[PDB]
Symmetry: C5
Subunit: 207 residues, 5 copies
Amino acid sequence: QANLMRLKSDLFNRSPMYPGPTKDDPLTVTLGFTLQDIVKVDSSTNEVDLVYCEQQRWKLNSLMWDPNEYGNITDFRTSAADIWTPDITAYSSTRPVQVLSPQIAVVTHDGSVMFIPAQRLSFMCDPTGVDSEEGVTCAVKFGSWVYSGFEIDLKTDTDQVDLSSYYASSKYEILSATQTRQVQHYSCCPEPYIDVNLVVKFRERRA
Amino acid sequence: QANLMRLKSDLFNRSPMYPGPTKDDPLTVTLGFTLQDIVKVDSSTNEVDLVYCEQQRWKLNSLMWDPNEYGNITDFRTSAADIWTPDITAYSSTRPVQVLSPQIAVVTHDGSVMFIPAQRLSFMCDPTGVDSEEGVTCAVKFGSWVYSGFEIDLKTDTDQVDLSSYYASSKYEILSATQTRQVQHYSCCPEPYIDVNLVVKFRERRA
Amino acid sequence: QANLMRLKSDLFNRSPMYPGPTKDDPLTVTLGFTLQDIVKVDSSTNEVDLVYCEQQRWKLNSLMWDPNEYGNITDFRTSAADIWTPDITAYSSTRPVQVLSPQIAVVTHDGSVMFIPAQRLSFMCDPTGVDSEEGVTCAVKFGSWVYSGFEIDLKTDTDQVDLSSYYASSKYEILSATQTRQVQHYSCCPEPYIDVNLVVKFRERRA
Amino acid sequence: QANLMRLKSDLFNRSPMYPGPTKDDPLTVTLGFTLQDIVKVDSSTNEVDLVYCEQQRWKLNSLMWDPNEYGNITDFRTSAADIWTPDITAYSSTRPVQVLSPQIAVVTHDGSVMFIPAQRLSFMCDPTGVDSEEGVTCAVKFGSWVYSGFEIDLKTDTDQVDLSSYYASSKYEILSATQTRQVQHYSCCPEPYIDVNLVVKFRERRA
Amino acid sequence: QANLMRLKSDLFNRSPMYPGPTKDDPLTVTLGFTLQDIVKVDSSTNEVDLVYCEQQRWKLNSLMWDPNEYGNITDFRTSAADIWTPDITAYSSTRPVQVLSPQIAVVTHDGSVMFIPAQRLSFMCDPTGVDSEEGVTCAVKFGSWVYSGFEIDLKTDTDQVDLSSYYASSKYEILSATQTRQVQHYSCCPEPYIDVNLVVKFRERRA
Ligand SMILES: CC(=O)OCC[N+](C)(C)C
Ligand SMILES: CC(=O)OCC[N+](C)(C)C
Ligand SMILES: CC(=O)OCC[N+](C)(C)C
Ligand SMILES: CC(=O)OCC[N+](C)(C)C
Ligand SMILES: CC(=O)OCC[N+](C)(C)C
Ligand SMILES: CC(=O)OCC[N+](C)(C)C
Ligand SMILES: CC(=O)OCC[N+](C)(C)C
Ligand SMILES: CC(=O)OCC[N+](C)(C)C
Ligand SMILES: CC(=O)OCC[N+](C)(C)C
Ligand SMILES: CC(=O)OCC[N+](C)(C)C
Ligand SMILES: [Cl-]
Ligand SMILES: [Cl-]
Ligand SMILES: [Cl-]
Ligand SMILES: [Cl-]
Ligand SMILES: [Cl-]
């Protein structure tokens, strides 16, 4: 307990709160979605509700340590409010995202962080054709709200969304689920922003 | 990281928290709207729900710095709770506005600040005629709640709302969307308050 | 900025937080309702939802200053969390009141404060007869929850509720709207509590 | 203002925050109910919503003072967050209780406290027979969640609920409303826990 | 009060906040479920709502004391925000869990802690067959979100869920309710995570 208490104290005191990435000190966040359920489809407003886990990984030099200096501690768990986190946002939500899991991250001696928030998202989607054989396709972009491609870059380990935890008895069955990196420009800003586009084809499951 | 940490420290210590504008030190906020979706229309209460982005720009001498003094840093991202922000409010909302994006602003070396919150608004609007060819027209005023024209002035870059991000498969199609600056008087107060009037003409989209 | 920064600093440091009124140091709050809309009527639970602005005015010796001592500053805007505010409560609400406007007050050199919160209230009201020619009458009392008449007194500038901002295309039209001061006794307490009774007669508006 | 400011300062500084009652230092809380309205009855989930006021009273030696030492101040109003309050909980709620009134208590020089929160409760209740002549009976227990009889005891002044403020035009009329002290044992714990059982018989009101 | 005030002061000052368990300092949490009610079943989204109490027990060397050193105090009640608590989470919730009881734990001189939060959970469950004689079976896993089996182990005193407080007049009757310990692997992580699987068989109750 003493060693971890010391490590946590030293990582916090060694330097003030990390000010986020810069053009000169950029960061690459690895995103990966685990789609658990398509809960609701609303045809009167064209909103669809998803339950998923957004897996996030990044590395920070400021969170690095030598295990030999801190009782061979290789990693630890900490509140996500105690460390810097990326501002990964759904670009087309219709409601504030609901967080379903504790806000705790895992920090490793190499400075790498893993943070997996489970969330419920309500986003823009016309479900017309959900009841058909072909089903309906809907997409939502995820990325930083304020950091461009020069400050925050995004990466995926695979183009395939994890469906190994998708609720079998859900009202909707998944025909396809894709997560692909893309670089866009916006009216507000001159720099190119980067995002992970979550595209999911689904239909009503027969009882 | 060191340079930005220093800049942020020096900008905060240079003077206590900015007390907002005054008659003697007025401010001009540039407002612009990017209408993403008309989510819901409720004819039983006469409420309409919009999803949009509110681009806000202002300039503060207190936030100015020389990039040559801080490792050629030209701008930075910071929590909107760490800086003064204008109190732009919808004058005719029926629910507390829901914030859909992170509360982070961008501050530039000339002292200018850009903050683009994404929000969901539920406001007063009779939708009667939404299903007709002509559609229905509804308006909502945005402006400071406590600062008059002598303290906060508002400006737009264009009278035409940004519709380049409007959800194509929305239940409602946009016939027209306008943003106009106007100056009004109220019973409470002797000074003229200024606002940006968002007027949007819309109808039900055919499948 | 310097003068206002100084005034605000001196007003906070000159004395600890104001402990509220007392029998020995009583206060008079001026109440005034601007009814903007009757949003919803629910006949299955007998609840009615209103959108209104509650103008509150009071004077405090502790908030007084000499403009000649602070660069001819006659007034300033401040967060309502930074100053004492009265606990004006609806005595018959069915839901926690939703605040629709920023929590900012205007303080003047004579120690007077003006605070205008915009709110949505869900209160006890049987709407039977709303569809009739005569319409329905419903009332809700507003007053301090813990302070009696000896500590907080209430006053109105007119017995007429401001209807100049009432939404024209509302589902309900106003036949009459009154705000009267009244003094009552309760089982709990020996002292007389005072309230402002909001009485509004309304009916369904024809297209 | 000076005397009250001083009293409140001295009451806070004389000793650290009160750690709650103990077997050695027990406390007796007096509960009372003022049932204002039976808002909703839901037969599809078996939930019933009440709007009531809970009068709570207890005495603490730590909150005692001599009025002659503090400008003949006999009592004062304070935020309920500034003092210890009991964990009186509804044992069978289906939703987190909504607080409708400000969280302010009244403290007297003898150390006695009075706190009357107005709340909306959604609790377990099968309404089958609400439309009959006999009506339906439903009950909800109120007690401390963590303190047993040896630490917190409960008392009522009357066994009759206060119905003098019950909304006349409510959808439901009260046939009977009782508040009775009872002592129970639970599977978790060996000590006897004490509660106040709120039993109310009601039916649908005829127009 | 003095002795407890001292004990609480000494337990807080003797060492900084406990950093949670480690591979080298693991912890075993005992889980128990008291199912109070199956509130709602939604066949249009496949969500089911439960009201239950989750009894949690763990022991910490850092919370140990000698009663003879602190006026024969054997235990005390404290805010759960003042002590470390495990991040026991429902792995398949569709909404953020609603807490229905005060967040207070009971700490004993041997360092053991008992914490019983009453909660409302909305989780993934197809209710098809709830109206049949056989009823429907639904399951939800509870475990730590970030700690593996090497850091947090789980244990149950019985496989049988406590039904002695189940609301008799609920819309749904319980046919069976089980709580069994299980060890799983996940896509994210290499270490085995452990959970308590809550399996409940229920059907619609006949009036
Ligand atoms: C800044 C602007 O015009 O809009 C950005 C929001 N987005 C990502 C959906 C198009
Ligand atoms: C720069 C800024 O604040 O945000 C706009 C949203 N975005 C990222 C897609 C263009
Ligand atoms: C000063 C104040 O609270 O304002 C009330 C109405 N308004 C918003 C137009 C000026
Ligand atoms: C006189 C006063 O309180 O202002 C209300 C103006 N309004 C409704 C548009 C906010
Ligand atoms: C004195 C106190 O706690 O409040 C009781 C309810 N009241 C005063 C509004 C009628
Ligand atoms: C304790 C007491 O008598 O209060 C009732 C609260 N009231 C009448 C506002 C609804
Ligand atoms: C351990 C436990 O919660 O037992 C029963 C409490 N009760 C009846 C409120 C549900
Ligand atoms: C002891 C504890 O934390 O919780 C038990 C619930 N109760 C109040 C009925 C006995
Ligand atoms: C490991 C972690 O950080 O959280 C992921 C969800 N879990 C634990 C059930 C696999
Ligand atoms: C990232 C990963 O594989 O974790 C899933 C956790 N679970 C099954 C609760 C949904
Ligand atoms: Cl301000
Ligand atoms: Cl940041
Ligand atoms: Cl107060
Ligand atoms: Cl306590
Ligand atoms: Cl932790």
